[PDB]
Symmetry: C3
């Protein structure tokens, strides 16, 4: 009975600590900046237009269109790089195109069968498929849904689903909200599982280059 009481008190302590953590995450999301360069419908339409072609040609055409419609906000050909992404038990790769304090645009996908935790969304993310399949298992339900090239899955803030991607699945991803908070989730398995310090290097490098591009465009627009 004494051990039961001690265990209940410890569980209550962990309960309130986790509640405070989630509350601080929600506060950071609420008080976040809302100056947006893109709209999610725009990225969704642009990615859905080229979903019928090969995914590499689609990547090329979408990058060209993004550079054409938003000059100074997309990285150059010299800065584009495929970087592994290990998070929540799954493994994929990304190619960052745009990333600021409130938005980011990248090409995400995997060439192998993988799946795991989607991560607690404290920012709004949208994925429009170009090839492969995307199986989502939302929280609270016992059934999953399948998504195909042309579909767009939007992840609201606070949602946590079970994601799964077949081999050769590739999509375009646009994130809106408090972008830095996602970094942790993007690097968790890189820190405590894969020990891939070079992947962490490449990730922070491309993010810093995207921030530098955004600041340079800001200065050139006001200067």
């Amino acid at each position: 009975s004494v051990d039961t009481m001690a265990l209940w008190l410890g569980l209550r302590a962990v309960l309130v600590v986790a509640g405070l953590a989630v509350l601080l995450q929600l506060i950071r999301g609420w008080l976040s900046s809302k100056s947006y360069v893109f709209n999610r419908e725009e990225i969704a339409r642009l990615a859905k237009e080229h979903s019928g072609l090969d995914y590499e040609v689609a990547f090329s055409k979408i990058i060209v269109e993004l550079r054409k419609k938003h000059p100074g906000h997309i990285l150059q050909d010299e800065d584009l790089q495929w970087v592994f992404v290990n998070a929540g038990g799954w493994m994929g790769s990304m190619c960052l195109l745009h990333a600021s304090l409130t938005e980011y645009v990248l090409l995400f996908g995997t060439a192998v069968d993988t799946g795991g935790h989607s991560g607690r969304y404290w920012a709004e993310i949208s994925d429009t498929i170009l090839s492969g399949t995307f199986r989502q298992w939302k929280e609270g339900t016992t059934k999953s849904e399948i998504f195909y090239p042309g579909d767009t899955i939007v992840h609201e803030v606070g949602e946590a689903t079970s994601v799964q991607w077949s081999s050769g699945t590739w999509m375009v991803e646009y994130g809106r909200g408090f972008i830095p908070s996602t970094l942790a989730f993007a690097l968790a398995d890189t820190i405590f599982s894969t020990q891939d310090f070079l992947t962490l290097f490449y990730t922070v490098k491309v993010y810093s280059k995207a921030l530098l591009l955004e600041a340079s465009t800001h200065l050139s627009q006001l200067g």
Copy 2:
């Protein structure tokens, strides 16, 4: 030769530390309380009896029968909730019905293909399959075994196995032993991989509510 000696000394240090950890686990397990409300054969027969129905109807009927045969030991309908479980590389979901210092009962399953480490804890676990398949690859062997609805896999005290569950696999799980020791493994991937503080919140909340129900039943029986 010097580096080899240093590496061997470090390996011996890790060896003795891990041995002391295993010794602490076994000591806190053997000397744990053994006040049992249920027995694994009761839950096994209750789950196998309704294993032919749809897994949702089976869940409902099993919950009703548990509340009929053990009234003050099953959580209320207002306290039932599906909570994600990320551990050992695999991801699923649970709904807890009973949980004490020495026992716990829940409904566990996944709607997607998953698998990984079963985990090591001082607790005899029993899983009776309601739907789906369960592949178990025990330690020390090079071949696995498949289990179908109606079967009951018994994870013994020294269980190091590889588990795998196909999409739509649902089962009823009963565990007796040092239940808090099973918390760590159940939350490790939640801490270092998923960054899901809300799932940790839900887990500790439902465990605290189950312990509260058990303590309330105990006090109402002794008073």
Copy 3:
């Protein structure tokens, strides 16, 4: 406006830390000990020659041939053991035959579908397949390659790939380079995921036994 610069400076700090980590990995792996007992071609042909038999008979004959051609460098039958290996999100099992500061030989494989990160280390790794399939997804590309019994996959120094093995895949693995640099990747999931301290016990025990056997052989050869 200002927080962009703040985040960029933080990313620069993380960048220099990760860069120093990678540079130290390179410098320590380079300029290391060059005492080699085996070579990847010998092990590759020894495994490919027996790749047509059942994998257990192949294991036995390969161990016998290794003890015949390199006596004193292979563990005894009393020291052989199958130990689970959780790393990078995948779960397999190993049987260590030889391990020193510069080389290691073991029998690896899995009885369940698994996959994940291969890991980065200054160590040339070669795997010759006896059964099952090995899908490798190298870094920087969007397509993977399948390998079959008889094939030998070379994990180059400093490379990072996505590995995937079907159920029943078994292979003979030979590592050359700075072996301790892999140890971290070999145990991360054991510490932050499986919490399996007995598997860690077994791993460090077999590594210490291999190092002790190597030291004994060296002393007997010079004494």
